[PDB]
Structure 1
Amino acid sequence: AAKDVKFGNDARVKMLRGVNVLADAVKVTLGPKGRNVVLDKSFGAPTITKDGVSVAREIELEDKFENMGAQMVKEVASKANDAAGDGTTTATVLAQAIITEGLKAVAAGMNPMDLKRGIDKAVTAAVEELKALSVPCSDSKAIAQVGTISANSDETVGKLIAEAMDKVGKEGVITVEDGTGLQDELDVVEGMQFDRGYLSPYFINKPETGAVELESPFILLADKKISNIREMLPVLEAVAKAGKPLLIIAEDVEGEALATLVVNTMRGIVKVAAVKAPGFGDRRKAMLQDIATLTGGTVISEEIGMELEKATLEDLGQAKRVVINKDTTTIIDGVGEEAAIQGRVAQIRQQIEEATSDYDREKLQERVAKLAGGVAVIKVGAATEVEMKEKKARVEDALHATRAAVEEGVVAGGGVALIRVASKLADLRGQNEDQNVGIKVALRAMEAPLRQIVLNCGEEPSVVANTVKGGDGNYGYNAATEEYGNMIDMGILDPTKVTRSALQYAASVAGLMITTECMVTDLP
């Protein structure tokens, strides 16, 4: 199709206009005194959000060159959300500041590539300084502070997240889902549990709770389909001689076998419960092997070279309790040696180290948690649906921030750490004068987040910026209280990883955006 071509300063002006539109929409949500943005939805009611990436993903402009600018700058927030899960608004603010200063430098006659090289050098030095400035975050009080700050200063969210992270451990998994009441609740499950219930309600022996309960059972792990009871007679006779319950986990069990088992259950010969194997395909085999290692049994598969009729008691696993209901089966205190379990989790860790997509990493981490740690679920409580969505977003942000802080440490919040780094980088020089101008551009842009935080509070950004720059260490400005003090003492903590990622992504996109000379897009 026919194209429209713009050259030089006209193209740069249109690009800056689009960048400014997107950044102005995003930046009103930054800090403890930021506000919400209402986003229209074609299907349903509008959503009200304080998240930078959610606002950024909805912005599209009528003018095509301004739209090109906005689409270019949207990638900063997208990448920050993908990487750290937090700090998208800060990244957008940094990108806009760099783009504006660099365009000013280009309009005065500077070489764009040298400016880009200077910006890259300054950002590398800043990343080194941030790494040197970090402190470990291991105590639960610091984790609670990080979660509170990341959830727009909500103490309950931070306390709940700290409790969940303490209970579940280091190898566990925490997820957030919608609740039903008005208060947040935490449900932590220890051991192995999968979303499979009994295949027949007649297996229930405790009708008061509507659940199947078995004490010290046998576990028959079959990686096959059981349809004819003839394959099951020998082991059934053996367990009847033993006199303890049996739990059969199979891919599926047919009607004749169900009828035989429910007949044998209530008649008193044997106590039997049957459920379906979790997962589909190779992952189902992996979960079956995990259960076998946990309970100390062996999976009966055709592909390995054994048949069901030849099974013995040694092949069956064992546990201490089994609780089954309509939806979930939990194995409690399965007898297994720590050597095999540790080997299995080490294998799954090595598998995690060689996987690409995040979904597969999440599934493997869930498996590791089921083997070694625990699983926690946080149910968010709210009166309405818009409130529920907003609070769920805040809780997820706090969860991501706590993970990042635990893995990489914390720095002073409120934009203070970036200012300290920029002050520490005041002697850095490049190869020529344009590279020095680029370094100065990056150092100036490093003060934008604090200025925006103060501007959102209704104060004067230049005065607060000068007062903070006059200090040293963790001295900073509390925007919620409007007071100066030690950032660490008042609990305004930022994870180091979030700050570093925001800086790197913003610089990477803005450096390329500065070097533009021509624009090609479709005609209106």
Structure 2
Amino acid sequence: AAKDVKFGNDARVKMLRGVNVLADAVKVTLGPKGRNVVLDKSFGAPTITKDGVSVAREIELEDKFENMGAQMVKEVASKANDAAGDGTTTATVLAQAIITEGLKAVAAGMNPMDLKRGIDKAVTAAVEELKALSVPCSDSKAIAQVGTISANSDETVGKLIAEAMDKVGKEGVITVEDGTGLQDELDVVEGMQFDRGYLSPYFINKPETGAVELESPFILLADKKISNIREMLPVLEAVAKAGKPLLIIAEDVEGEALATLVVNTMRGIVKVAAVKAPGFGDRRKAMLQDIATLTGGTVISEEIGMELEKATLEDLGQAKRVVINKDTTTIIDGVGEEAAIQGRVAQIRQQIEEATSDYDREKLQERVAKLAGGVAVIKVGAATEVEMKEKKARVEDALHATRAAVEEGVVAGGGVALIRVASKLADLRGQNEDQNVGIKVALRAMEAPLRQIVLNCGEEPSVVANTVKGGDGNYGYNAATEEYGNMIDMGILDPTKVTRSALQYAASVAGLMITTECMVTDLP
């Protein structure tokens, strides 16, 4: 299509108005005194969130150029989310900030490219700075503090999270789902368990709800379905002999097997029942050895050097007992040596450090957690639906933040850390003048977070900022209590990693953005 090109100032301005719109719409939601925004939806009802990135995405401008600018800054708010799922709003604030000043300096007649470098440098510096102040977040107390501070000051949250982490361990998995009631609720799975119910409902051991509890069973693992392939009685009878209950796992099972199986377990011939493995081919099969090895079983290489009956009763794995309903199965404890356990674990180390990261290390550590650790789930409380969302939302942020503080430590919130490291680079200089401004520009912008927070409190951003800058170390203003003091003792912690990503991602784009001299796009 025919284009519309714009150069210099004109373009820039447009670009800026664009940024501001986006920015302004995300600022409103910063800090404890942060406010909400409503995203309309033709879909169902409008959405009410305080999640910066959530907002960003919805912003699109009619002015093709004002729009481009917005479409750009939008990615910082975005990347910031992919990085550590929080700090999004904050990051955005900084760009808005950097850009404003930057442009003003380009308008000042400076070479933009050096401004960029000056900023870049200024940032690389600021980063080491943070890494310096970053201090280990390890105790449950600290962990609940970031949770809480992340979930717009909700202790119940940090509290809950703190606990989960304290249970499932370090590699234990944690997820949030909408709860039933209005109270938040924490459930923690113990041992090995997945999402497969029994195909033989008739095979319900003791409790109802389809509760099966095969006491001291032999576990069986295969690689096929058993319609009429019922052949395998040697294996069967083998246990009928030892008089032990039996659990099975494979592609599937047809009535032919079940039917007979039924009356057998009935007549008190052999108390048994079975449930399908995990899910997809590579999936399920991927997850069995682990199971076998766990209970000390010998998975059946139906595809390799094994067959149906082709397998002795001793191949079977053994566990205290099991618990099954119409949807899930759980092994109380497959007696399997730790030489085996940590072994099947050690080999997970390569799986872990993977270049796939997302979706890979997810379902990955899951088993990892089930192969020794513990799995946890959180249910969010909310009367309405428009509440259940927002709530559950923040809950995750925090869930993330903690994850980050742990791996990368923390620093002082209230955007003090930055304002602090800023003073530390008061003497940073670069190759030429422009560059020095470029730096100065950046430092100057690092007061953004802080004073937006303040402003979201209807108070003098500049006045606070001063008194705060007059202080040292972790002296900081507490927006919530409206009084200064030590940000850490007050439990106002920001996972070091977010603060860093926010600054980086922010600059990464801001920088470029301010080096626009021309812009092309379609006609109105």
Contact 2:230 2:256 in 1 (8 A): no
- 2:305 maps to 1:305: yes
Distance 1:444 1:476 in 2: 18
Map Cα deviations across residues 259-291 of structure 1 (whole Å, 9 max, x no partner): 110021101111111110112111211111111
Structure 2 residue aligned with 1:27: 27
Map Cα deviations across residues 201-239 of structure 1 (whole Å, 9 max, x no partner): 110132545311111100010112222254221011110
Map Cα deviations across residues 393-422 of structure 1 (whole Å, 9 max, x no partner): 110111001110111111000010001100
Distance 1:442 1:47 in 2: 34
Map Cα deviations across residues 408-455 of structure 1 (whole Å, 9 max, x no partner): 111000010001100011111100001101010011001110010000
Contact 2:118 2:439 in 1 (8 A): yes
Distance 2:354 2:35 in 1: 41
Distance 1:310 1:392 in 2: 51
Distance 2:196 2:149 in 1: 38
Contact 1:171 1:372 in 2 (8 A): no
Distance 1:279 1:332 in 2: 22
Distance 1:245 1:209 in 2: 20
* Change beyond 3 A, Cα 1:462–1:230: closer
Structure 2 residue aligned with 1:360: 360
Contact 1:415 1:449 in 2 (8 A): yes
1:442 is paired with a residue of what secondary structure?
A: helix
Number of equivalenced pairs:
524
**Higher mean C-alpha displacement, 270-279 vs 62-71:** 270-279
Distance 2:354 2:81 in 1: 22
* Cα shift at 1:153: 0.6
* Cα shift at 1:255: 1.9
Map Cα deviations across residues 489-517 of structure 1 (whole Å, 9 max, x no partner): 11101110000000000000011001100
Distance 1:476 1:139 in 2: 23
* Cα shift at 1:357: 4.7
* Change beyond 3 A, Cα 1:62–1:230: closer
Query: What's the TM-score once normalised by structure 2's chain length?
Result: 0.99
Distance 1:262 1:432 in 2: 85
Distance 2:495 2:211 in 1: 45
* Cα shift at 1:90: 0.7
Contact 1:177 1:378 in 2 (8 A): yes
Distance 2:228 2:236 in 1: 13
Distance 1:84 1:183 in 2: 27
Contact 1:475 1:486 in 2 (8 A): yes
Contact 1:229 1:260 in 2 (8 A): no
**Higher mean C-alpha displacement, 226-235 vs 63-72:** 226-235
* Cα shift at 1:144: 0.8
Contact 2:223 2:303 in 1 (8 A): no
- 2:175 maps to 1:175: yes
* Cα shift at 1:308: 1.9
Structure 2 residue aligned with 1:131: 131
Distance 1:32 1:151 in 2: 9
* Cα shift at 1:294: 1.1
Contact 1:416 1:476 in 2 (8 A): yes
* Cα shift at 1:302: 2.3
Contact 2:53 2:78 in 1 (8 A): yes
Contact 2:381 2:388 in 1 (8 A): yes
Contact 2:210 2:324 in 1 (8 A): no
Distance 2:236 2:362 in 1: 38
* Cα shift at 1:351: 1.1
2:18 is paired with a residue of what secondary structure?
A: helix
* Cα shift at 1:355: 3.6
Contact 1:411 1:494 in 2 (8 A): yes
* Change beyond 3 A, Cα 1:189–1:134: same
Structure 2 unmatched ranges of 5 or more: none
- 2:449 maps to 1:449: yes
Contact 1:84 1:400 in 2 (8 A): yes
**Percent identity of equivalent pairs:** 100
Contact 1:223 1:288 in 2 (8 A): no
* Cα shift at 1:167: 1.1
Alignment of 1:377-416 (within 5 A): 377-416=377-416
Map Cα deviations across residues 148-196 of structure 1 (whole Å, 9 max, x no partner): 1000111111111111111111110000000110100100001111110
Map Cα deviations across residues 282-308 of structure 1 (whole Å, 9 max, x no partner): 121111111111111011122221112
2:248 is paired with a residue of what secondary structure?
A: strand
* Cα shift at 1:310: 2.1
Alignment of 1:183-332 (within 5 A): 183-228=183-228, 230-332=230-332
Contact 1:232 1:309 in 2 (8 A): yes
Distance 1:121 1:357 in 2: 29
1:220 is paired with a residue of what secondary structure?
A: strand
